[PDB]
Amino acid sequence: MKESLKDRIRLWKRLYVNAFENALNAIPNVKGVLLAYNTNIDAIKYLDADDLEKRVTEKGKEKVFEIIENPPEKISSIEELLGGILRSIKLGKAMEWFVESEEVRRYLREWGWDELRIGGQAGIMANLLGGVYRIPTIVHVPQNPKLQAELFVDGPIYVPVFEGNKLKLVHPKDAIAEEEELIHYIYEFPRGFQVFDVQAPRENRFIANADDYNARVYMRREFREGFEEITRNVELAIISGLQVLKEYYPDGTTYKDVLDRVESHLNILNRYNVKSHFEFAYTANRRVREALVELLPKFTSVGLNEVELASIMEIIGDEELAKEVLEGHIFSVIDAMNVLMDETGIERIHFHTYGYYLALTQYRGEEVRDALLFASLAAAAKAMKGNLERIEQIRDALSVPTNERAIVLEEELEKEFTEFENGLIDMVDRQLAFVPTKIVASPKSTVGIGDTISSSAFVSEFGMRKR
Numbered sequence: 001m002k003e004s005l006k007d008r009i010r011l012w013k014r015l016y017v018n019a020f021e022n023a024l025n026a027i028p029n030v031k032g033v034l035l036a037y038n039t040n041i042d043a044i045k046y047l048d049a050d051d052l053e054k055r056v057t058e059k060g061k062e063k064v065f066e067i068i069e070n071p072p073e074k075i076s077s078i079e080e081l082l083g084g085i086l087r088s089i090k091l092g093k094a095m096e097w098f099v100e101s102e103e104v105r106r107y108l109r110e111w112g113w114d115e116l117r118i119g120g121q122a123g124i125m126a127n128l129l130g131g132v133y134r135i136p137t138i139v140h141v142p143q144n145p146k147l148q149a150e151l152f153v154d155g156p157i158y159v160p161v162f163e164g165n166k167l168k169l170v171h172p173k174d175a176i177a178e179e180e181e182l183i184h185y186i187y188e189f190p191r192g193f194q195v196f197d198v199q200a201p202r203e204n205r206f207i208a209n210a211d212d213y214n215a216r217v218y219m220r221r222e223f224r225e226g227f228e229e230i231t232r233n234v235e236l237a238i239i240s241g242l243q244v245l246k247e248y249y250p251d252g253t254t255y256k257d258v259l260d261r262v263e264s265h266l267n268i269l270n271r272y273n274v275k276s277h278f279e280f281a282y283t284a285n286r287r288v289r290e291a292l293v294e295l296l297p298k299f300t301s302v303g304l305n306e307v308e309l310a311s312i313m314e315i316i317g318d319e320e321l322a323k324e325v326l327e328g329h330i331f332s333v334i335d336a337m338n339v340l341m342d343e344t345g346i347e348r349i350h351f352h353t354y355g356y357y358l359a360l361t362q363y364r365g366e367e368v369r370d371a372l373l374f375a376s377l378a379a380a381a382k383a384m385k386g387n388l389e390r391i392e393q394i395r396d397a398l399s400v401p402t403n404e405r406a407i408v409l410e411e412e413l414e415k416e417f418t419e420f421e422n423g424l425i426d427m428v429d430r431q432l433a434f435v436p437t438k439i440v441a442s443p444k445s446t447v448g449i450g451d452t453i454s455s456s457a458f459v460s461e462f463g464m465r466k467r
């Protein structure tokens, strides 16, 4: 049956408002979520031409400009920091270098920040799931100074504290201690920024990471010892922050030290039938990347984008597929997703990119589609306001026009697969769900959108399936 694009656009409108209502009613059904490993502080500085100008000349825009062409590994100089910000302005691509010099670290603080917000994939997810969705959340916070603890929004957000051979769950502000401030200085520039000669073709950002704890994924005592106690409190779990692991460290330690600890956590989660999602962020190290892929079988769900899916295909050996996946060919993406599920036996894969999301699941049902639709609204709301606070703000996203090209793209899925409903395809032993998303032109924040996308779909889908 023929279906005009205007009718299709109308049809998705109804699906979106229904998914939303369905999600709002299901969310209250999730008993608890554990957010693990990376949490920190995000110090945001809105770049000012004159300031950066005055600043670069100071050190001497000599070395600074040499850094643009020959970028270093980490930031060990003030030249390397400014050369790095500019370069990020040039290529207009998002970068992040690790500040190794305590000297540069003092520079960063003096330079200051315009505002502060929680950082870390776990941290951002805590404020969203706990503060916004109000789902009782337990989160890992490596260092909890007062500056860190107060970045947490009021809501059912807890941190585990060993109260005399008694594991208690208390709010961050009630668990402050004299620890280190783990700051990630985020420098952002508009779609058109003006510095020296260089112009920015897009609104991006450079991150100066002065975080020594999340770099090595150090675990709090409670997570290394009372993990089984914590786990008893949750229904779901979202793991992240491992993409930082290196094969070898100068102190003779290795990635194995950490993964060994992580694998035993997954076994406890499994033992209690906790559904877990892994955020497979891009992992530059191949050996570490291979290790993470072998861990996948122990997870219920996975989330990844194009670059990440492709990166897995490369190590999995499917080098031809990875190339097309990076090429953005949607029928190739589906292929890679099926290959990955064949390879790992994982229960669910949520793929997100610009314009549409895909979810390959072994189980069937509309909940997977509505969850992806709720997540798309949440991502739009977030990009719109920059900062979410109430679950209502998400209702505003309904006014954002759906990606029309993704709608046209469904027609091809339709002639290729067995759509039994819109965005729903029946496969022999699995289901495929497709959802055209809502792109926000010139967004506010854009800092934790990917986390917003993955956690919102994973959590809401579960509440909906929990029924």
Ligand SMILES: Nc1ncnc2c1ncn2[C@@H]1O[C@H](COP(=O)(O)OP(=O)(O)O)[C@@H](O)[C@H]1O
Residues within 6 Å of the ligand: 305, 352, 353, 354, 355, 379, 380, 383, 438, 439, 440, 441, 442, 443, 446, 447, 448, 449, 450, 451, 453
């Ligand atoms: N302006 C925007 N409007 C709607 N969605 C966006 C926008 N910018 C990014 N997104 C979505 O969020 C995702 C970003 O996630 P990801 O690629 O993992 O990167 P990051 O972790 O840096 O946010 C994209 O895949 C895209 O689907």
